[PDB]
Every structure is written in structure tokens, then in C-alpha cells.
């Protein structure tokens, strides 16, 4: 159809990359924008 990728799960997500970064505590795949401790607001910041 068009392109092939697997971005992170979020409503404010507007970035698509090959491999998403893995949080230290959340250990989840996310973009650089959300990767920010302030953006994600990880409880175990
Ligand atoms: Zn994202
Ligand atoms: Zn996190």
C-alpha cells in the first residue's frame, strides 16, 4: 500500500523510526520525543 513501520503507541505521537528506544524502567518501545523523562513522566524517573 504505502510504507511499513511500527511506531510507538500514543495519541500525541508524530514520529516514525526503524527501532524505538527502550525505557530503563518501562522497558517499552517509544520514540525520542516520548523518550524524554519529562514527556513520558516515568514514575521511576
Ligand atoms: Zn511515538
Ligand atoms: Zn518511561
Curated annotation (Swiss-Prot):
Q: Which positions are annotated as binding Zn(2+) 3?
A: 8, 13, 31, 34
**Which residues of the sequence carry a binding annotation for Zn(2+) 4?**
23, 26, 40, 42
Subcellular location(s) per record: Cytoplasm, Stress granule
ZnF (AN1-type) ranges = 4-45
According to its UniProt entry, what is the function of this protein? Plays a role in the regulation of cytoplasmic stress granules (SGs) turnover. SGs are dynamic and transient cytoplasmic ribonucleoprotein assemblies important for cellular protein homeostasis when protein production is suspended after acute exogenous stress. Associates with SGs and is involved in the efficient and specific arsenite-induced clearance process of SGs through the recruitment of the ubiquitin-selective ATPase VCP and the 26S proteasome.
Show the domain comment: The ubiquitin-like region is necessary for its localization to stress granules (SGs) in a VCP-independent manner. The AN1-type 1 and 2 zinc finger domains are necessary for the recruitment of the 26S proteasome to SGs. Both the AN1-type 1 and 2 zinc finger domains and the ubiquitin-like region are necessary for efficient SGs clearance upon specific arsenite-induced responses.
Summarize subunit and interaction data from the UniProt record for this chain.
Answer: Associates with the 26S proteasome; this association occurs upon exposure to arsenite and is reduced in the presence of ATP. Interacts (via AN1-type 1 and 2 zinc fingers) with PSMD1; this interaction is increased upon arsenite treatment and occurs in an ATP-independent manner. Interacts with PSMC4. Interacts with PSMA1. Interacts (via its ubiquitin-like region) with VCP; this interaction occurs in an arsenite-dependent manner and is necessary for the recruitment of the ubiquitin-selective ATPase VCP to stress granules (SGs).
- Protein's name in the database: AN1-type zinc finger protein 1
Residues included from the entire protein? 60 to 101 of 268
Amino acid at each position: 500500500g504505502g510504507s511499513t513501520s511500527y511506531p510507538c503507541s500514543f495519541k500525541d505521537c508524530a514520529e516514525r523510526e526503524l527501532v524505538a528506544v527502550i525505557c530503563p524502567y518501562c522497558e517499552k518501545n517509544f520514540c525520542l520525543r516520548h523518550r524524554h523523562q519529562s514527556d513520558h513522566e516515568c514514575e521511576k524517573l
